[PDB]
Amino acid sequence: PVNPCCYYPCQHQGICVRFGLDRYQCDCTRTGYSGPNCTIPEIWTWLRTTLRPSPSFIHFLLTHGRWLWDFVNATFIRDTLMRLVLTVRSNLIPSPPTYNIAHDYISWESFSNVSYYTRILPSVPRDCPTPMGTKGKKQLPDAEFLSRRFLLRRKFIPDPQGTNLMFAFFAQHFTHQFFKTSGKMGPGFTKALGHGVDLGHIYGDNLERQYQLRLFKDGKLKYQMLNGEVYPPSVEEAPVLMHYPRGIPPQSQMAVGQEVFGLLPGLMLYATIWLREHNRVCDLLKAEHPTWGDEQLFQTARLILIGETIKIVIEEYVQQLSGYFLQLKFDPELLFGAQFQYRNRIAMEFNQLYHWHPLMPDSFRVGPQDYSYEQFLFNTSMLVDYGVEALVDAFSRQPAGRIGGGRNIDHHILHVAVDVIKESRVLRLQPFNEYRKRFGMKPYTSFQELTGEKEMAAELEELYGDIDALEFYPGLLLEKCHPNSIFGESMIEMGAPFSLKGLLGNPICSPEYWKASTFGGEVGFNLVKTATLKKLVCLNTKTCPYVSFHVPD
Amino acid sequence: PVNPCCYYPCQHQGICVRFGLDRYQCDCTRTGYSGPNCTIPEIWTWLRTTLRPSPSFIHFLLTHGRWLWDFVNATFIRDTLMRLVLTVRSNLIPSPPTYNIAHDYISWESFSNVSYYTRILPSVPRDCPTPMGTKGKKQLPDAEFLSRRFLLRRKFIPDPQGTNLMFAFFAQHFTHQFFKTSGKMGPGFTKALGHGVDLGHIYGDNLERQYQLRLFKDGKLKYQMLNGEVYPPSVEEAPVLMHYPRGIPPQSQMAVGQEVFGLLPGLMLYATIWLREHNRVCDLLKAEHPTWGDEQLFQTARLILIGETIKIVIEEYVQQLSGYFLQLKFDPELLFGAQFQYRNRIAMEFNQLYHWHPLMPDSFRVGPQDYSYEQFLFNTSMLVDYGVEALVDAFSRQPAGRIGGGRNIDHHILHVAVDVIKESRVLRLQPFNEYRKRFGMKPYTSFQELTGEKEMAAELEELYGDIDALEFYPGLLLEKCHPNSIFGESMIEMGAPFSLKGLLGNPICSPEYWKASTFGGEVGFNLVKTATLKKLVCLNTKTCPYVSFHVPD
Numbered sequence A, B: 001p002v003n004p005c006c007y008y009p010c011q012h013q014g015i016c017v018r019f020g021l022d023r024y025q026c027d028c029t030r031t032g033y034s035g036p037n038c039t040i041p042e043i044w045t046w047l048r049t050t051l052r053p054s055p056s057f058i059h060f061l062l063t064h065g066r067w068l069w070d071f072v073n074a075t076f077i078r079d080t081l082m083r084l085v086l087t088v089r090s091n092l093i094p095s096p097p098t099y100n101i102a103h104d105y106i107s108w109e110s111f112s113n114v115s116y117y118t119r120i121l122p123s124v125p126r127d128c129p130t131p132m133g134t135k136g137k138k139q140l141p142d143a144e145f146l147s148r149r150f151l152l153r154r155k156f157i158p159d160p161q162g163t164n165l166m167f168a169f170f171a172q173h174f175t176h177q178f179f180k181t182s183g184k185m186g187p188g189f190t191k192a193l194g195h196g197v198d199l200g201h202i203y204g205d206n207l208e209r210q211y212q213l214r215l216f217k218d219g220k221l222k223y224q225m226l227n228g229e230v231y232p233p234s235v236e237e238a239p240v241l242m243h244y245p246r247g248i249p250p251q252s253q254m255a256v257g258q259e260v261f262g263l264l265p266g267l268m269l270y271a272t273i274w275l276r277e278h279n280r281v282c283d284l285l286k287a288e289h290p291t292w293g294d295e296q297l298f299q300t301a302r303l304i305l306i307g308e309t310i311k312i313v314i315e316e317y318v319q320q321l322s323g324y325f326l327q328l329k330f331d332p333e334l335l336f337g338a339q340f341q342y343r344n345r346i347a348m349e350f351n352q353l354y355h356w357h358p359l360m361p362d363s364f365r366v367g368p369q370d371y372s373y374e375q376f377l378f379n380t381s382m383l384v385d386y387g388v389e390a391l392v393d394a395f396s397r398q399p400a401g402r403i404g405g406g407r408n409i410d411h412h413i414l415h416v417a418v419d420v421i422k423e424s425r426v427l428r429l430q431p432f433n434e435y436r437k438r439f440g441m442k443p444y445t446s447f448q449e450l451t452g453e454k455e456m457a458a459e460l461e462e463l464y465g466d467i468d469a470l471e472f473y474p475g476l477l478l479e480k481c482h483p484n485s486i487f488g489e490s491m492i493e494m495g496a497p498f499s500l501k502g503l504l505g506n507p508i509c510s511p512e513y514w515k516a517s518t519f520g521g522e523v524g525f526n527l528v529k530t531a532t533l534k535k536l537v538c539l540n541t542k543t544c545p546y547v548s549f550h551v552p553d
């Protein structure tokens, strides 16, 4: 019989619905296109497409000509373009969410059950001739061999954008609040039910964990004093599930919102920094409202820290990553005259996309010392030994690896990428070319056009058989890179829409929540508006070291 | 020190926030007002208030002049006005939701924890001089004595709008999918985590329950055959928790989505019809899609039945109790050019408001038979004995009681109204007049202005002391009802914003969901678009009885 939806016949966000025994129909509703396969353009769509500049042209404009951008940033155009960046990107993501691992169709279970990761494109049907649809071979390339030949680091390729480990660990810390895949429920299921910037990696994904982390006085979190410095509490003081190597003494075990943070000094670094910020905010709130109870001081402080995150993420984190000459601005009031949905659901493709393990180097240089992976991983002493000040300085000076290009994942953590590709076939993600079309890009006609070179393309031509069979995750990390950039063109075009919908879709960005009273007055509101990475560290430390998302020079 | 927020100083949705020892500050952001109390209006605010007609004047316009409304309904002005009713009403509701029983302030916990009912106006602070704020007596009037003197039915007062029991049972059935107060967690908590029209009273509030009702063949729900007619299955066949009187084994019980439905035949009547509807819809969808599995057939039928519910509710259910000459219309497309959040959280005020126990008659009539409360309540054979047709005919012919005016609750179920007022004091709901202001109405200056008479006004003035001490629920029922109507001025103005935000805020009404493909093509899309109370009943029965929300002339 053969399922007609395996060919992906519907174009431009049309929906393949199986009718009768062998036929199909495309629902081209509000797609801007008509006809059986949604290809005949409406008057406005045809006009827009011929007048639309290429995605690369827009990226070129945003990365060149300082004289124009010095002017733009000092004018109203900054706010006009930022609004355009917000609206155009985030509208590519369905809201309310559509599909999940169980349903390749809209249902109430896909809407209400927040334990699911959502998906933009439906899974490849289980009745297709090839696991990627119709094109390609019956068996996809070996996940170990594909990572070994194309992803394994032979030499450290530094990021030309000057990105450091301070960014890398921020990226990991920030993302692991909404990427919490369930080990028992399996792939496609999440434990971070907040689905965005909830800070559940500081406070906990569940209520009882939070209560266990809370000192229940002045709204503050629990903490311990080691060498005159404030650190996260021990397991004895806060009895919560923490993933530590079995046998390790409880005095060496620290307790934070996310279970996996104790395994890396870079992760527990930010956990300390943010904990110091929470209690600091409580002190400012208490001086402003001495009549407030413990519960209000905590909840008000959480929203301030949620606002501080989004501020730093957009104006510094994205600023370093995108390399835009356009000065980015966190201002929810930009969307106040627009049709925007203040909700978010984490997609599995955003999970796959955010596996930036190439960022990690060969070693971890802290001052005169150079620490290996076996010296750095699962180390429960390093954070206390050096302190926040010394480590933040050390991570801001060490270069990070280039994400795109290829052959840049250190062999110690390569197994992750292997499992990511394995998870992609379990989830049955559509080919890379299908996602290219979903995010408004032209699909690649050959492997030579993808990598931009002759060598690595020829081997991939033999393995996959066809370009329309190329997988999602390998495509993003093997795509040609414009010199000076951190990754390929697709990463920006696929990632930004998710990322902005997660940031600005946070309820605090809504007209209902974006008020002074929400953050306990003007003091709390200004802390959100003026927050910086530098102010996140140095205000919570004795001295102020070099702190940035980029290395010196 | 005296709490300043006990005076409710901040007007027009301004937020009272405690500062220092004895000081307060109003957050007048986006209220349309400025200053210390949000009392001085902006240029556009002053313009709106002076040109705005009174609530009772627009209600007058909608309920008078047949000839003008015949013209309007046949033109685009029908759609123009419906869009206005949709937008202006539902915007009075905070979205995303703000407060709950735990927090009288915006928090992440209030946003994320869906086990809470939300609220529109914050509670009366615990450290206020009087239980209702600053007004009235130290001890609030007795709950049982208030119900016996002002709410207890002497002579039966029927609805002047000719509303029947078919409406009354629909009301109780329809509401108990989003009104499910958790007796274990307490007042202000809810098991109905859908917070809207999810049909959890048919399928279940949780997944494990839903799976027990489902056949897992053809997307259908389980059913038993009695007298050659389709009925809900036994609890012996579908093992789900149902609240039946002790001594009644699962062999006689019937298994449906909502636990309390076995207590009333009228509730079980509507459980049957929708179950017959679900399986009838499954049959239609199976013919269009013979390659669909069980899971897709079930989920798609649910979306259709949700679509059918909101359709009938707006164009007939709301049409009956509103008494508008304007032909109401369910078209989600009306909101596609508007700022509208497709989400809903059930408020405690909507819960309190929807206690329409006055609708219930002195005795239930089924043709020549007249069954009392003892015979009707907990009856297990009445539905099977008579059938669907006979009971639909009976409930459609018998008039329901007038909700407003007072003194129209039968002595059998008066204890509910006692528990509503008692729950209101635990929830610490603000005074009636404070809620009047919040839904754009002038507060009553006296009890005589509220009632319309003299006797009950003077006795309430003795019990409460002040009009600003009057409670939410008693105020709604003892209010004066305009020209021949179900209830008073406030019931529309307070309940309509809650309802329309609940109905149109359903995700199926969003541009993403409101497609033909979501309902499995045009056949499923038309069943929503052409849904009727009559078509819900007569298409699922052998013969077609009298079916309406009003009695025959």
Ligand SMILES: *[C@@H]1O[C@H](CO)[C@@H](O[C@H]2O[C@H](CO)[C@@H](O[C@@H]3O[C@H](CO[C@H]4O[C@H](CO[C@H]5O[C@H](CO)[C@@H](O)[C@H](O)[C@@H]5O)[C@@H](O)[C@H](O)[C@@H]4O)[C@@H](O)[C@H](O)[C@@H]3O)[C@H](O)[C@H]2NC(C)=O)[C@H](O)[C@H]1NC(C)=O
Binding pocket: A206, A207, A208, A212, A239, B113, B114, B115, B185, B186, B189
């Ligand atoms: C949405 O929100 C509601 C309401 O908040 C919530 O309902 C429940 O919430 C919690 C449980 O999740 C219940 O909490 C109650 O309060 C006491 C607190 O007293 C003490 O608790 C600690 C003692 O217990 C612990 O002891 C040791 C450590 O001390 C520990 O090792 C044990 O494992 C044990 O847990 C103590 O540390 C602390 O200092 C306090 O003195 C709890 O003990 C107990 O759990 C109580 O039941 C609420 O009562 C629940 N219901 C209500 C109505 O409030 C929902 O869970 C939430 N929903 C979601 C989906 O998140």
Ligand SMILES: *[C@@H]1O[C@H](CO)[C@@H](O[C@@H]2O[C@H](CO)[C@@H](O[C@@H]3O[C@H](CO[C@@H]4O[C@H](CO)[C@@H](O)[C@H](O)[C@@H]4O)[C@@H](O)[C@H](O)[C@@H]3O)[C@H](O)[C@H]2NC(C)=O)[C@H](O)[C@H]1NC(C)=O
Binding pocket: A374, A375, A376, A379, A380, A381, A382, A385, A386
């Ligand atoms: C977790 O991380 C902590 C980081 O604090 C580790 O603790 C530290 O471990 C080092 C050993 O590596 C301790 O000794 C230090 O190391 C030097 C090594 O010699 C140096 O090597 C270079 C290049 O080979 C040579 O040019 C020079 O000889 C140079 O000195 C040693 O000489 C010194 O004694 C120096 O202190 C260090 O003391 C210790 N830190 C603290 C605060 O005690 C820890 O090992 C690690 N844990 C695990 C389980 O891996």
Ligand SMILES: *[C@@H]1O[C@H](CO)[C@@H](O[C@@H]2O[C@H](CO)[C@@H](O[C@@H]3O[C@H](CO[C@@H]4O[C@H](CO)[C@@H](O)[C@H](O)[C@@H]4O)[C@@H](O)[C@H](O)[C@@H]3O)[C@H](O)[C@H]2NC(C)=O)[C@H](O)[C@H]1NC(C)=O
Binding pocket: B368, B369, B370, B374, B375, B376, B379, B380, B381, B382, B383, B385, B386
């Ligand atoms: C659950 O509901 C069922 C209905 O399905 C109840 O069973 C029914 O009970 C009624 C009495 O309440 C039975 O009526 C019988 O028929 C006549 C009725 O009298 C007639 O009507 C009026 C008023 O009564 C009189 O003025 C007329 O003159 C006329 O006679 C009577 O003669 C019989 O004695 C008897 O009452 C009905 O038949 C019966 N149905 C079935 C199928 O058994 C059931 O009681 C109820 N459960 C509980 C606990 O009450």
Ligand SMILES: *[C@@H]1O[C@H](CO)[C@@H](O[C@H]2O[C@H](CO)[C@@H](O[C@@H]3O[C@H](CO[C@@H]4O[C@H](CO)[C@@H](O)[C@H](O)[C@@H]4O)[C@@H](O)[C@H](O)[C@@H]3O)[C@H](O)[C@H]2NC(C)=O)[C@H](O)[C@H]1NC(C)=O
Binding pocket: A113, A114, A115, A184, A185, A186, A189, B206, B207, B208, B211
């Ligand atoms: C969000 O959705 C998740 C996935 O649907 C839910 O995860 C869990 O719920 C599933 C369904 O309850 C679990 O599936 C299991 O199904 C087997 C099959 O047994 C069958 O059901 C009956 C068993 O009593 C039998 O009568 C029948 O004949 C048949 O054999 C059953 O054995 C298990 O008991 C269980 O129900 C599943 O284990 C689980 N996880 C996953 C990954 O599927 C979430 O509950 C849901 N979340 C929310 C908040 O609703």
Ligand code: HEM
Binding pocket: A168, A169, A171, A172, A175, A179, A180, A181, A264, A351, A354, A355, A356, A357, A359, A360, A377, A413, A415, A416, A419, A420
């Ligand atoms: C040396 C440090 C690192 C180690 C040891 C490491 C290893 C791991 C491990 C063990 C997992 C969980 C198992 C799995 O999904 O394969 C994981 C997942 C993941 N990693 Fe890393 N990685 C590192 C660096 C990073 C960084 C810097 C980022 C951020 C750019 C990152 C992004 C992710 C993401 C998004 C997941 C999936 C999380 C989930 O779905 O639950 N990793 N990695």
Ligand code: HEM
Binding pocket: B168, B169, B171, B172, B173, B175, B179, B180, B181, B264, B351, B354, B355, B356, B357, B359, B360, B413, B416, B419, B420
């Ligand atoms: C004679 C028929 C009815 C009976 C026997 C009945 C019974 C009850 C009972 C026992 C409660 C719980 C009271 C408590 O303990 O707090 C309740 C609450 C309630 N009633 Fe009724 N009722 C009837 C009719 C109606 C009708 C017609 C409506 C109109 C919609 C209605 C609306 C409600 C609502 C919304 C609740 C609160 C639900 C919740 O949050 O749990 N009732 N009723």
Ligand SMILES: *[C@@H]1O[C@H](CO)[C@@H](O[C@H]2O[C@H](CO)[C@@H](O)[C@H](O)[C@H]2NC(C)=O)[C@H](O)[C@H]1NC(C)=O
Binding pocket: A004, A007, A009, A036, A037
């Ligand atoms: C409709 O879209 C389909 C995409 O599959 C196009 O291809 C179909 O029609 C062709 C011409 O009749 C056939 O050669 C193909 O076999 C057939 N595809 C499949 C999978 O069977 C088709 O061109 C489109 N129709 C129009 C009018 O453009």
Ligand SMILES: CCCCCCCCO[C@@H]1O[C@H](CO)[C@@H](O)[C@H](O)[C@H]1O
Binding pocket: A050, A051, A052, A053, A054, A056, A057, A060
């Ligand atoms: C479709 C009409 C819009 C005008 C598009 C002009 C073509 C853009 O051409 C662009 O030129 C840049 C350098 O100038 C390159 O960096 C880009 O790769 C290339 O796409």
Ligand SMILES: CCCCCCCCO[C@@H]1O[C@H](CO)[C@@H](O)[C@H](O)[C@H]1O
Binding pocket: A054, A055, A056, A058, A059, A061, A062, A081, A084, A085, A088, A089, A092, A439, A440, A441, A493, A497
């Ligand atoms: C001159 C700079 C203008 C920047 C404003 C445009 C930002 C919108 O970004 C656009 O988003 C679309 C959806 O993701 C993509 O299809 C486009 O390629 C991308 O440029």
Ligand SMILES: CCCCCCCCO[C@@H]1O[C@H](CO)[C@@H](O)[C@H](O)[C@H]1O
Binding pocket: B050, B051, B052, B053, B054, B057
């Ligand atoms: C100076 C401009 C004011 C004219 C706009 C008046 C709109 C208010 O509408 C008024 O509502 C009253 C009910 O309170 C009715 O009595 C009036 O007839 C009606 O015009």
Ligand SMILES: CCCCCCCCO[C@@H]1O[C@H](CO)[C@@H](O)[C@H](O)[C@H]1O
Binding pocket: B048, B049, B050, B052, B053, B054, B055, B058, B059, B084, B085, B088, B089, B439, B440, B441
């Ligand atoms: C001082 C001005 C504030 C009073 C506001 C009262 C306006 C009249 O009341 C209005 O009735 C309409 C009935 O269709 C609804 O659309 C509106 O939601 C309702 O506010």
Ligand SMILES: O=C(O)Cc1ccccc1Nc1c(Cl)cccc1Cl
Binding pocket: A313, A318, A321, A322, A491, A492, A493, A494, A495, A496, A497, A499, A500
């Ligand atoms: O957006 C983020 O938070 C990180 C991220 C990851 C992948 C792709 C884009 C982005 N951000 C981002 C955004 Cl939100 C806009 C423009 C350019 C970029 Cl790189």
Ligand SMILES: O=C(O)Cc1ccccc1Nc1c(Cl)cccc1Cl
Binding pocket: B317, B318, B321, B322, B491, B492, B493, B494, B495, B496, B497, B499, B500
């Ligand atoms: O829609 C409902 O649930 C019925 C309901 C209950 C309370 C208050 C209003 C309404 N309906 C209603 C609506 Cl939603 C709009 C205009 C007029 C009326 Cl009577």
